[PDB]
Design a protein around this ligand. Structure first.
Ligand SMILES: *[C@@H]1O[C@H](CO[C@@H]2O[C@@H](C)[C@@H](O)[C@@H](O)[C@@H]2O)[C@@H](O[C@@H]2O[C@H](CO)[C@@H](O[C@@H]3O[C@H](CO[C@H]4O[C@H](CO)[C@@H](O)[C@H](O)[C@@H]4O[C@@H]4O[C@H](CO)[C@@H](O)[C@H](O)[C@H]4NC(C)=O)[C@@H](O)[C@H](O[C@H]4O[C@H](CO)[C@@H](O)[C@H](O)[C@@H]4O[C@@H]4O[C@H](CO)[C@@H](O)[C@H](O)[C@H]4NC(C)=O)[C@@H]3O)[C@H](O)[C@H]2NC(C)=O)[C@H](O)[C@H]1NC(C)=O
Ligand SMILES: *[C@@H]1O[C@H](CO[C@@H]2O[C@@H](C)[C@@H](O)[C@@H](O)[C@@H]2O)[C@@H](O[C@@H]2O[C@H](CO)[C@@H](O[C@@H]3O[C@H](CO[C@H]4O[C@H](CO)[C@@H](O)[C@H](O)[C@@H]4O[C@@H]4O[C@H](CO)[C@@H](O)[C@H](O)[C@H]4NC(C)=O)[C@@H](O)[C@H](O[C@H]4O[C@H](CO)[C@@H](O)[C@H](O)[C@@H]4O)[C@@H]3O)[C@H](O)[C@H]2NC(C)=O)[C@H](O)[C@H]1NC(C)=O
Lengths: 208, 209
């Protein structure tokens, strides 16, 4: 009955020293008469301790949903250590195990280019500011937009796309009002990747 | 046990008269002692019998992967008929069914914009010509690149991405040699969509010194 789902830390957390990367180990479909679940975590085969098991979250479909969280070190994740979650329950015949780690492969540095709107789009009510990010490996990346320190949240980013070489690329599109573009406001495409210098770069975009 | 995944026809196939739109019905995780799969197709509740079941594709994880394909008519897809795939197998307690159709909703016309390389990229050996396609619904679209009549095939396109409004967008990236860009050659982003005037539009891109 019980199923297991081991999720990696958010890319933004693994690349920012201030944040705390967490590996979460979701267990679903737990019965009422077999409610006890027990986790064991391993890091390259080495038992680790002091995980945090959140309280049982009783579901709409008359089951439980237990979650155990393990905070991992920034360096250990980015060095590519394998984190294993061993679930044990009465309903299970044999303990389930899942393993997760950073996408293995030679890290490659993204080139970040900003592209302004076409003059055809300038006739429209709003305009699209484009940020090309290309040549990065692996596909674990985070792209954000901002003006000054204050962030812009009216943007979408495309899934990473595998190129002719081993690398990836993507586009991020910030939609702004035409007025604010023509007033000469500065927008900044911030990118975060493991292969970037200090895990961060930022390119600006303005009217000439 | 067995899982089912019903996929729509390639957007390029539904929009080109010469091509053949197909609905594929993938069945995964089939055991060795229950290898027989049997499909039944329906079009708005009407049984059809013109499918082709491909041979079992034995997987790396000691299971099979059976696929049944149904060719659909261009007009039937674009009119929005519902295609259903009913899988049956020993391992299943009750036959599984999945349904797919064209995304129902007011069709919206893509705006097509071409963007030249940044001057930072101009230092590199090759440069990237960008084609933004935005504001289209549904997500059935096809993008090609060309110079003159002859096509350019060194390009990649992103999956359609859902925007803040109901519409979609995507980017297509043509990689060309820096020389050919600076010689002032004209490249053309051709787009094909249900909502486009005559199901086709094309925007050009050049050095424009
Ligand atoms: C044994 O191996 C096989 C083979 O797997 C392959 O080989 C192994 C060795 C590994 O390397 C695998 O990584 C590799 O894939 C396993 O078979 C796989 O089984 C899983 C399910 O367990 C299937 O997952 C689904 O995948 C589809 C997307 O699949 C397309 O894209 C894949 C790459 O991205 C590609 O590999 C596939 O072939 C397929 O590509 C399409 O193929 C068709 C025909 O081949 C073609 O016409 C198309 O053009 C082509 N398109 C593209 C884009 O490539 C994904 O959509 C599914 O997601 C749904 O279901 C999930 C539940 O599993 C759920 O979590 C998701 O959220 C999602 O659910 C849907 O969500 C929408 C939201 O709007 C909702 O509306 C829907 O109702 C909802 N549906 C459901 C059912 O919930 C899903 O992830 C793999 O496709 C399949 N792989 C292959 C190649 O067949 C097998 O499982 C292994 N067995 C064991 C025991 O381990
Ligand atoms: C009772 O209800 C439970 C609650 O779930 C919700 O409601 C039910 C009714 C359904 O509608 C659910 O789909 C819905 O989620 C059920 O639990 C769910 O079980 C299913 C199947 O066992 C799980 O499916 C798996 O989902 C994975 C992704 O999971 C993330 O995203 C989900 C939403 O998109 C979210 O519900 C999950 O909690 C989880 O969220 C992430 O959590 C981490 C922290 O742990 C965060 O860091 C992320 O940011 C979160 N992200 C998001 C988007 O929220 C899939 O990855 C997984 O697919 C993989 O495994 C399968 C094999 O199973 C492969 O085939 C596949 O290729 C892939 O590798 C799978 O689809 C679902 O996630 C569970 N939901 C929750 C909340 O735990 C109970 O099952 C249900 N019980 C019964 C008896 O019906």
């Amino acid at each position: 009955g019980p199923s297991v789902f081991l999720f990696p830390p958010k890319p933004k957390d693994t690349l920012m020293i201030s944040r705390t990367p967490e590996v979460t180990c979701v267990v679903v479909d737990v019965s009422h008469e077999d409610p006890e679940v027990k986790f064991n975590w391993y890091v390259d085969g080495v038992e680790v301790h002091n995980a945090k098991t959140k309280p049982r979250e009783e579901q709409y479909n008359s089951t439980y949903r237990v979650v155990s969280v393990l905070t991992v070190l920034h360096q250990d994740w980015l060095n590519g250590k394998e984190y294993k979650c061993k679930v044990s329950n009465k309903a299970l015949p044999a303990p389930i195990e899942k393993t997760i780690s950073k996408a293995k492969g030679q890290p490659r540095e993204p080139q970040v280019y900003t592209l302004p709107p076409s003059r055809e789009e300038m006739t429209k009510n709003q305009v699209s500011l484009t940020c090309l990010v290309k040549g990065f490996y692996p596909s674990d990346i985070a792209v954000e937009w901002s003006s000054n320190g204050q962030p812009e949240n009216n943007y979408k980013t495309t899934p990473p796309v595998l190129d002719s070489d081993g690398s990836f690329f993507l586009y991020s599109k910030l939609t702004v009002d035409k007025s604010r573009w023509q007033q000469g406001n500065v927008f900044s495409c911030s990118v975060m990747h493991e292969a970037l210098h200090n895990h961060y770069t930022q390119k600006s975009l303005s009217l000439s």
